[PDB]
């Protein structure tokens, strides 16, 4: 007969915790009976408990420069377990907001690149690229190229084909884009090649 086991995806006393991923808690040999997370001013963080009670996860954006307190209780045939932990999230030197072109909902020509322009210097171009997901349909191969320290573009080898959906997810919220420059938020754009 085992006592329930709680496992969180963050450690107690962690610092610099990145806010580009949710925080989770799992139970084994039992189910989650209560999970709460609050910030340093006592504001609850939204989360979702799976219907089977085995996993809870945050469902909204954690803030920069915050201390979060997580409490969980699991209950099983073998008794109860509780855990509390506290951690601190990333403290950016600066924030940068990206702007994507073409604009959301636009219909554009066969020579138009995807362009992602950040409003501050990007010292880690590789980190910025990794945070950007391009979807094409019909699918075509393409690649990123930087114009300068602020603007990265993406295109196929030659021209686009008319009737192509292009989806651009710029997910740099929580990502250190070099020298403590973090994404201010995520951006989502979808357009069509006419």
Residue numbers in the entry: 57 to 250
Show passages lifted from the paper.
The transpeptidase LtdMt2 catalyzes the formation of the (3–3) cross-links characteristic of the peptidoglycan layer in the Mycobacterium tuberculosis cell wall. The structure analysis reveals that LdtMt2 folds into three domains: two domains in the N-terminal part, both of which show an immunoglobulin-related fold, and a C-­terminal transpeptidase domain. LdtMt2 (Rv2518c) has been reported to be expressed at the highest level and has been found to be essential for virulence.
The structure of the segment comprising the A and B domains was solved to 1.45 Å resolution by molecular replacement using the B domain (residues 149–250) as the search model. The structure of the AB module includes residues 57–250, approximately half of the extramembrane part of LdtMt2, and 309 water molecules. Each domain in the model contains a bound sulfate ion located on the protein surface. In domain A the sulfate is anchored to the protein through interactions with Asn95, Asn97, Arg99 and Arg122, whereas in the B domain the ligand forms hydrogen bonds to the side chains of Tyr201, Arg209 and Arg211. A structural classification of immunoglobulin-like β-­sandwich domains defined four subclasses, s-type, h-type, c-type and v-­type, based on strand connectivity and topology. Both immunoglobulin-like domains of LdtMt2 belong to the c-type Ig fold, with strand orders a–b–e–d and c–­f–g in the two antiparallel β-sheets. The similarity between the A and B domains is reflected in the Cα r.m.s.d. of 2.7 Å based on 85 aligned residues. The sequence identity derived from structural alignment of the two domains is 12% which does not provide strong evidence for gene duplication. The domain interface accounts for 350 Å2 of buried surface area including 13 and ten buried residues from the A and B domains, respectively.
